[PDB]
């Protein structure tokens, strides 16, 4: 609507058979864990999801056991918290959305699990929004708890700008510039919204090779069985 | 049902075995001319409605934009 | 010409050649295809 359609970026997965850069997904998961997890939730992504992807079973294991998870009231009606398991999902920031409303000045930070899929031109939007907290121009004035992000609908996103250059340090050491961080978290959120991106593209490559083998051969069989007629010569011979 | 379909008489229909004839006789030899022959018998009936759909679509888009564009004279 | 007379003329053998070939084709296709995908990404 009334917002800049985020400019497309030359993503490493933008191509037709181009997979995701898994180091960028690992860095973006670190960005989410250290910055984005304070307000946003990832209800459909368990720690196991990380396993095999930018993280191993044991890698995720330590990551899962860094946090604590209430494991129910056990058998003594005793709600109790335990270190996370590879089967545990990502922890909630808030127990219910009304606590999110109370803690975020009436705004609800949405599930970031499918944000890229749920936002038109998500990957771009995400990058743009996170990197689009420009100053409101003359004539527009925003109330407290609002920020002029041209890309955000209305240009008034409650979320304050969360990525200040060198906000967090990448374990890999890649300079943590605001952008390098926004690109990594956009790749990660993308991965989140489609953990199968890579596997699929492989299927699609096998499908293109199989169809390139099979279409001319089936066409040749059809043209064999239809040549007979396509050569049929009709002649009218009235006895006259 | 094949048989007792209609009355056909005094006609001779010749044909050849599939394996005896080339699979793609002059496929691009005459195929291209024919496809082109075909396109020129149907292009004037088919294309100009979609041409004016393209003009109406663009027009609508641009007109809509102008509609959205602020009236400079207004607010001044 | 020999092949036709040997594995493609008797329908039973036709099926045999098809099945056996398919059994191996998967190995080859998967291998070759994977090579390509990996090279691409």
């Amino acid at each position: 609507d009334l917002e800049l359609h985020p400019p497309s970026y030359p993503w490493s997965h933008r191509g037709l058979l181009s997979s995701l850069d898994h180091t960028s997904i690992r860095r973006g998961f670190q960005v989410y864990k250290q910055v984005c997890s304070s307000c946003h939730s990832m209800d459909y992504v368990a720690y196991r999801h990380l396993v095999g992807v930018c993280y191993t079973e044991e890698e995720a294991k330590a990551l899962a056991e860094e946090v604590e998870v209430q494991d129910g009231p056990n058998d003594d009606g005793e709600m109790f918290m335990r270190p996370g398991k590879l089967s545990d999902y990502f922890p909630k920031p808030y127990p219910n959305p009304e606590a999110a409303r109370a803690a975020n000045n009436g705004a609800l930070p949405p599930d970031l699990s499918y944000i890229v899929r749920a936002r038109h031109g998500g990957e771009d939007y995400v990058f743009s929004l996170l990197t689009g907290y420009c100053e409101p121009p003359t004539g527009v004035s925003l109330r407290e708890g609002l920020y002029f992000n041209p890309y955000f609908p209305g240009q008034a996103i409650g979320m304050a700008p969360p990525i200040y250059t060198e906000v967090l340090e990448y374990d890999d050491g890649t300079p943590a510039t605001m952008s390098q961080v926004a690109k990594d978290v956009a790749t990660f959120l993308r991965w989140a919204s489609e953990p199968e991106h890579d596997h699929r593209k492989r299927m699609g490559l096998k499908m293109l090779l199989m169809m390139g083998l099979l279409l001319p051969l089936t066409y040749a069989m059809k043209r064999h069985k239809w040549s007979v007629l396509k050569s049929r010569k009709l002649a009218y011979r009235p006895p006259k | 049902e094949f048989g007792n379909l209609a009355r056909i008489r005094h006609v001779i229909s010749y044909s050849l075995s599939p394996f005896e004839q080339r699979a793609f006789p002059s496929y691009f030899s005459k195929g291209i001319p024919n496809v082109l022959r075909r396109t020129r018998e149907r292009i004037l009936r088919v294309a100009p409605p979609f041409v004016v759909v393209y003009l109406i679509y663009t027009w609508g888009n641009q007109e809509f934009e102008q509609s959205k564009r602020k009236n400079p004279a207004m607010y001044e | 010409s020999r092949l036709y007379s040997l594995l493609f003329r008797r329908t039973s053998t036709f099926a045999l050649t098809i099945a056996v070939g398919a059994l191996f084709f998967e190995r080859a296709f998967d291998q070759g295809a994977d090579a390509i995908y990996e090279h691409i990404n």
Partner: peptide, 24 residues
């Protein structure tokens, strides 16, 4: 009789002799 008329040549369509049949 019918003998008067002759079979049209399909050579144009006709491709390349039992020797060849096996291959064909």
């Amino acid at each position: 009789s019918h003998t008067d008329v002759k079979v049209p040549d399909f050579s144009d369509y006709r491709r390349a002799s039992k020797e060849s049949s096996e291959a064909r």
